[PDB]
Design a binder for this molecule. Structure first.
Ligand SMILES: COc1ccc([N+](=O)[O-])cc1O
Ligand SMILES: COc1ccc([N+](=O)[O-])cc1O
Ligand SMILES: [Zn+2]
Ligand SMILES: [Zn+2]
Ligand SMILES: [Zn+2]
Ligand SMILES: [Zn+2]
Lengths: 361, 361
């Protein structure tokens, strides 16, 4: 059975289980069951499923080299699909809440969930909470008897926590750390001293690499009972490296990819985000350029946004991106070589993840 | 050691553990650690700690009749305090998110967290997420080796889910179920046909009885390794009964308790909530009264709110409350008697919970 069709078929199974359980144990009525079905579809479907499918692909790699009864193969793949949907539902939770937090308009070509006329922020915040709860409901149901349940739940909850911490790093990245204070409205930085590579790297590591790369890779190992097969320190290092490259790409696209192709209007400049573009620009600008950047960054005024985009273009950040990319290639190939020492099979799965990430349009 | 002082001392311990771990494993800086410390204090402290202290009191009851080394007594009480703080932090998550969802102004005499000048909704939604994540972080740390860990985490996550489902029941209680539709802005009911005792009971059961009464009672049993000591069906029944009475009291106070004593301005009438007052009024009103209620309910206009409060007063709902209270007393005393069959000790703990709830100002 092709991997994607299996993964989509398990979605339908998981949805039916969750909604039937709401009817049989939570006293839900059919109209609210329908609302939640539509909410689940709208928030969980329509992406590329890169995260969930990585769990499946890692498990497939091990199936190819490990002796198993057919029924065991099917159980492992089913577990990989359920675990993959746990990650997709976790992402769906974060996108629902983040779109509300940020006042975002569009997501994947459609209005953000909270903007649907019959949803509203009042319902959408709670819908996002339900999405997160569903990750646990499906784990307890499908993995109740599994040897990996404890490790999987502990990993999942540490990754979720890291992600929430990273969101804090992200939403506060345009303020001076020494002025953070719940009692005092937060001004934007004027010196941009905290727009550094190390600080940027911390934001990205926590806000997206744990849930986008580390969690799918390790979940694939856990459902395969293969985690002792690998050097976990190398898995972490390669996850954080590839995840950072993925975010740098997203940052560049926020500014330069047409909104029709991107699926939203990028607002990182207006929002004064600590983006790879801003950090790298400040890493090579002269004094006059820095001053012009400070005069225009972080303002909704489209004229000022236009000055910033021109500063970026004139600064030839394309060349910095190429140099960054070439270094990531060196380092990821090195880590893949190191992963071959204990598991050539897993190293190949990581090579596939890198190729997909690197070649992403 | 007095129970409350022990419970508060464990708060300081848990806070220090969480913040130290953020520094040592999550790369946090001191100013963000300070923000999160203030967030934790502001959102978790200042209530009566009824929920968390119930865990401690249930555990104390069993300690009085069970043979244990002193060090075991101390471990059980410490676990009960950590588990109690898990519930308090879960509540703190729900109050942060609910105040945002509802546009609330005050909570416990202070501004709602999201209203603090240096917080804002953008940060506060995520702060609420961190609060929930902390419930799991503390469980894995303090209960890692405990026999009850699996049961406790499974219970906790089912109660959290029930609570989120109940919030959906609550926020949709003024709409006609057959018209729920993410695509269509939701009108308020005009017939109020779904303002019934059974529908009200479903809202309250899920939105507050699971986390306010069932979870503390059963967590107290789990940290005492005493759950086989009791009839779990009776624990559920008495939790749902006492929890409903607790919410009816809250509903009456929303309308009639002065805001200085209540700690907020009640807006259930303006928000068109399915409250005990509205259901009970509609259960005894004549046609003219029903028509006047429909003409004024669910509007911010203070003149209309005033008509509703007068309708309630003229309807002598005080007498319905007294009859409701007398029936709850009968039923709770009956369930306590039944609990004595297998555990007089636990029955007494429940009697104490009821007395505290019943005598609440
Ligand atoms: C977590 O795995 C992945 C994450 C992202 C991509 N990508 O192509 O962007 C591919 C992956 O297999
Ligand atoms: C969950 O236990 C309790 C809940 C509420 C109260 N009360 O007095 O409101 C007392 C309790 O011991
Ligand atoms: Zn965001
Ligand atoms: Zn972006
Ligand atoms: Zn509410
Ligand atoms: Zn209330």
């Amino acid at each position: 059975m092709a991997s994607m069709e299996r993964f989509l078929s398990v979605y339908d199974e998981v949805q039916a289980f969750l909604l039937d359980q709401l009817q049989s144990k939570y006293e839900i009525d059919p109209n609210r069951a329908r609302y939640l079905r539509i909410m689940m579809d709208t928030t969980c479907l329509g992406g590329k499923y890169f995260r969930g499918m990585t769990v499946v692909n890692v498990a497939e790699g091990f199936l190819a080299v490990t002796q198993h009864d057919e029924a065991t193969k099917e159980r492992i793949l089913h577990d990989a699909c359920v675990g993959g949907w746990m990650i997709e539902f976790l992402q769906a939770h974060y996108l629902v809440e983040d779109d509300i937090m940020d006042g975002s308009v569009m997501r994947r070509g459609k209005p953000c969930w909270y903007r649907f006329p019959g949803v509203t922020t009042q319902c959408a915040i709670n819908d996002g909470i339900i999405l997160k709860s569903w990750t646990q409901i499906m784990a307890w149901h499908y993995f109740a008897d599994r040897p990996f349940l404890k490790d999987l739940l502990c990993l999942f909850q540490k990754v979720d926590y890291a992600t929430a911490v990273g969101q804090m790093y992200d939403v506060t990245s345009m303020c001076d750390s020494n002025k953070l204070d719940p009692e005092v409205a937060q001004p934007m930085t004027t010196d941009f001293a905290e727009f550094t590579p190390a600080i940027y790297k911390r934001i990205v590591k926590y806000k997206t690499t744990f849930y986008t790369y580390l969690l799918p890779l390790v979940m694939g190992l856990l459902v395969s009972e293969a985690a002792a097969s690998v050097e976990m320190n190398l898995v972490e290092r390669v996850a954080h490296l590839i995840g950072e490259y993925f975010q740098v790409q997203d940052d560049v696209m926020d500014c330069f990819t047409p909104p029709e192709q991107l699926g939203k209007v990028g607002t990182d400049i207006e929002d004064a985000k600590c983006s790879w573009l801003a950090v790298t620009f400040l890493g090579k600008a002269n004094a006059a350029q820095v001053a012009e950047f400070k005069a225009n960054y972080g303002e909704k005024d489209p004229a000022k946004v236009a000055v910033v985009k021109r500063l970026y273009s004139k600064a030839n950040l394309q060349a910095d991106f190429a140099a960054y990319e070439a270094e990531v290639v060196r380092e990821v190939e090195s880590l893949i070589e190191q992963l071959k020492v204990k598991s050539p099979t897993f190293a190949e799965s990581v090579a596939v993840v890198w190729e997909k990430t690197h070649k992403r349009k």
